[PDB]
Homo-oligomer: A and B are copies of this chain.
Amino acid sequence: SLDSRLPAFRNLSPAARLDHIGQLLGLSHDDVSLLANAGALPMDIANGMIENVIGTFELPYAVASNFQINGRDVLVPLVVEEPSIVAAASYMAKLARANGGFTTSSSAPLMHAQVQIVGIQDPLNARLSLLRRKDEIIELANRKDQLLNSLGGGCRDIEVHTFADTPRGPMLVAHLIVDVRDAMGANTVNTMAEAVAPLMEAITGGQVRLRILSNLADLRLARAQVRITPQQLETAEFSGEAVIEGILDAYAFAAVDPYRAATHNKGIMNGIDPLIVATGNDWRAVEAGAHAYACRSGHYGSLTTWEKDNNGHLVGTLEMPMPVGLVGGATKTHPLAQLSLRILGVKTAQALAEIAVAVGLAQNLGAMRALATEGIQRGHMALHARNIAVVAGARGDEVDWVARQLVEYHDVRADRAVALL
C-alpha cells in the first residue's frame, strides 16, 4: 500500500522529488522523462488543441503530500502559480491523517441538458404535454447514444421549467437529466439536446432556441468530511480550543458577508483548480458551477461548513458540484494529464471528483487556520520572498539571497526588501 507522507519532500530538489515519486509509484523511465524534461506537450498536439498557437506556456507541477481519502493514501498533482497553496494543503492533510484522513462520497455523474423553447402562447400547458410524453423523449435521447447506455449511463429523466414572463416573452426550458459516466458531459448532453429538439417542437408547437449543457451541475455533487482535534491546533501562543473558536468565527463571517464568502470560496478553488489543470480538465466549468451553487439559496455564502462536535472537535464538510472527466479533450491528448491520472490512480471520474473536494476542504482549512491565529502573511509571505525581491529591484543575483534577509527579519515587505540600497 502507498504511503503519501513524504518526509523532507519540501527540501528535496525537483529532480530528487521526482525520483522519490518515481520509486513510490513504480513509474517507468518514460514517465519521469515527461516531467524531468521540458516540452512534454508536443507542438503538433498543442497546435491542434486551440487556434493561433505560437508556442506553449509553463506552470510549476507539484505534488501535495499526506492525503488519505477513504482510508487509502493518494498523491495529488497540482499546477498553479501562487505560493503556499501546496504547503498549506499538505499541512492540513497531515493533520487529518491522525483522525482517519478524509471521508468522501459522490452522487451519480448527472448533468443537465437545457432545451429552450420560445414562440409559445401557452408555455404552462406545453410543459405538461412534454411531461406526459417523457418516456418517448427519454427513449429518443437514449437511442442516440447506445455506447453510453452500455457503459452504464444515459438519459434518466426530464424536468421542465417555465419562465412565462420575461422581457422577450414566455419561455419554456426542458432539462434532460443525463448520466455521463466518466466524461465531463458537454458533447454527450449537447447531442441529446439536439436529438430531442424536433420532437419537443412538435409536442409544444414552439420554436426551440438553445440546446446546451448547464454548468450549474447541482446533481453532480461530491462530498468530503474532515475532523481536527484541539490538540492538533495548539500553538505556542494560542490554545487549540481558541483556534477552533476563531475558525468558527471566520466561518460565520463567511456565511453572512458575501465580501468574505467570495474570498473564502476562492481559497477552496486554490486547491481544486490546480488539480483540474493537472488532469487536463476545464477549470472554467468547475469554477462556474462552484460559485453559482454557493448562491443557490438567494444569498452568496460559503461552500464549506465548519462546526464543533459534542467532543469539542472541529468538523468540516465540503459539498459542491464537481463535473470532471477522465476521457475527452485535453485529458487524453496531454501526456502529463494522463500521467496525473496514473499518479492519482483514479478509475472513475467520480473518484477524481472526491479527491478534488477533499483537497478543497483541506485548502479552506489551511487558510482559515492561519487567518485565525498568526495571520496569513507569516507563512505565505515567507514562501513569497523570492518574488518580493524581484519586485523591489533586484532579481538578478541579488534575488535568492535578500529573500533570506526579509524572512529572518520576519518582514517580507517591498519597503524592506529594497534595503539593497
Q: Residues of A with Cβ closer than 8 Å to B?
A: 6, 9-10, 13-14, 17-18, 21, 34-36, 38-41, 43, 46-65, 78-87, 90, 112, 114, 116, 118, 144-148, 161, 163, 165-168, 171, 173, 175, 187, 190-191, 194, 197-198, 201, 208-216, 246, 248-250, 252-253, 255-263, 265-266, 269-270, 273, 277-278, 280, 282-285, 287-289, 291-292, 294-296, 298-300, 327-330, 332-334, 336, 371-372, 374-377, 380-381, 383-384, 386-387, 390-392, 395, 400, 413-415, 418
Which residues of B are found within 8 Å of A194, using beta-carbon distances? 375, 377
- Is B46 in contact with A60, judged by CB distance below 8 angstroms? yes
Which residues of B are found within 8 Å of A148, using beta-carbon distances? 414
- Chain B residue with Cβ nearest A282: B82
- Is A118 in contact with B82, judged by CB distance below 8 angstroms? no
Which residues of B are found within 8 Å of A257, using beta-carbon distances? 161, 163, 173
Which residues of B are found within 8 Å of A262, using beta-carbon distances? 214-216, 288-289, 292
The 7 closest A-B pairs by CB, nearest first: A38-B39, A35-B55, A291-B291, A266-B288, A55-B61, A262-B292, A81-B330
- Chain B residue with Cβ nearest A56: B58
Q: Could you name 19 residue pairs across A and B whose Cβ atoms are closer than 8 Å? A: A34-B55, A39-B58, A47-B60, A48-B400, A49-B83, A50-B86, A52-B65, A55-B336, A114-B263, A116-B253, A118-B249, A144-B413, A173-B253, A190-B377, A210-B253, A262-B292, A266-B285, A269-B284, A298-B298
A137 and B35 alpha carbons, distance in the complex (Å): 49
- Is A258 in contact with B415, judged by CB distance below 8 angstroms? no
Interchain nearest-CB distance for A289 vs B (Å): 6
- Is B289 in contact with A270, judged by CB distance below 8 angstroms? no
Q: Which residue of B171, B246, B283 contacts A209 across the interface (Cβ within 8 Å)?
A: B246
- Chain B residue with Cβ nearest A280: B81
- Is B57 in contact with A61, judged by CB distance below 8 angstroms? yes
- Is A14 in contact with B43, judged by CB distance below 8 angstroms? yes
Q: Which residue of B61, B259, B289, B332 contacts A54 across the interface (Cβ within 8 Å)?
A: B61
Which residues of B are found within 8 Å of A260, using beta-carbon distances? 114, 116, 173, 210, 212, 214
- Is A295 in contact with B300, judged by CB distance below 8 angstroms? yes
Known: A81-B334, A145-B415. Contact between A250 and B210, CB under 8 A?
yes
Interchain nearest-CB distance for A202 vs B (Å): 11
Interchain nearest-CB distance for A20 vs B (Å): 9
Q: Name the residue among A61, A145, A246 with the largest chain B CB count within 10 angstroms.
A: A61
- Is A48 in contact with B258, judged by CB distance below 8 angstroms? no
Q: Name the residue among A112, A147, A209, A252 with the largest chain B CB count within 10 angstroms.
A: A209
